[model samples]
Target: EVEALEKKVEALELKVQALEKKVEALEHGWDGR
Candidate 1:
């Protein structure tokens, strides 16, 4: 159970990081074709 929780937290952190990166690119006017 503890190991599973650890994996979940890591996954959540990765998702948040990706979200921030995406938002940052958008804020910079990254309007891709």
Candidate 2:
């Protein structure tokens, strides 16, 4: 139970980190052009 929750939280953390990076890139005017 606890282990499963920890794994889920870790996955969510990774997703949040990736999303933050994507937002930062967009905010910096990176449009993949």
lDDT of 2 by residue, 1-33 (tens): 999999999999999999998998888878771
Q: Evaluate all candidate structures by whole-model CA lDDT and list the values in order.
A: 0.91, 0.91
Which runs of model 2 end up more than 4 angstroms from their true locations? 31-33
Cand. 1 TM to true fold: 0.72
Model 1 RMSD vs true structure: 2.1
Q: Tell me, by TM-score, which candidate is best.
A: 2
Error at 7, model 2, angstroms:
0.1
Write down the TM-score of every candidate.
0.72, 0.82
Cα deviation in Å at residue 33, candidate 2? 6.6
lDDT of 1: 0.91
